[PDB]
Amino acid sequence: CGVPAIQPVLSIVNGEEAVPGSWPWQVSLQDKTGFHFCGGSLINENWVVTAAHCGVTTSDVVVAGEFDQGSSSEKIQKLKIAKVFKNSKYNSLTINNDITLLKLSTAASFSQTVSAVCLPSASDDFAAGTTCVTTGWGLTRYTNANTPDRLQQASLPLLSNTNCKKYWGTKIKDAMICAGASGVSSCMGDSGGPLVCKKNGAWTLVGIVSWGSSTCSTSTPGVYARVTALVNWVQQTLAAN
């Protein structure tokens, strides 16, 4: 996992076009009509992890191997959702434990543009200041009300929960990690998307786009569901289902 066949080149408000297929685990969750409402990450051939607040139903579809959503020449993979596993400790009030697993009704076919991201150890630690990457088809301006056609990427630092609280107060729980306030910002449409850091040579999913500034302020840290604090749950679900 976490080893793209097409190495991503790095130089979402203030993002930048990603190299096509350089983030192979990035999927798009779309409704019946093809509307993109959230991102997601392939953790293996049968499961996708996304944010719990996306409210995904088996009536939705997972799209893999996609770069330009407006194109019809790409070799994408529309997969069906067999079952949705929402985290029981999720609270739409505190937006904590914002995670949901999606078991596919048909395994994906890994190739050069479709593969899995790695999951961390419940004990794994990622230092503040660490540069990581987030991706997605979220607005590129809060003033756009229209998502970009092509997948965006952005580099951003991780903040310590302590500094992050200077921005959001006590809304920041232990199952949350912040990144940003550096010139970039996730935005409407990025929810469920990944926040990955490269460790020991492979890309690891350390965060899931959750919530942040109502105007995608590039100078306010964004909040992501903290994967290290949720992997045990993820693992048990896979093991039992």
Partner: protein, 32 residues
């Protein structure tokens, strides 16, 4: 920006004014 405590609603997103009085909402994609 707001009054710590109140919970508003964007197009299709939930917002909860954090203790620091600022609108922190979900970043889901709204079709409307």
């Amino acid at each position: 920006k707001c009054t710590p405590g109140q919970v508003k609603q964007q197009d299709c997103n939930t917002c909860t004014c954090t203790p620091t009085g600022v609108w922190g909402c979900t970043l889901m994609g709204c079709q409307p």
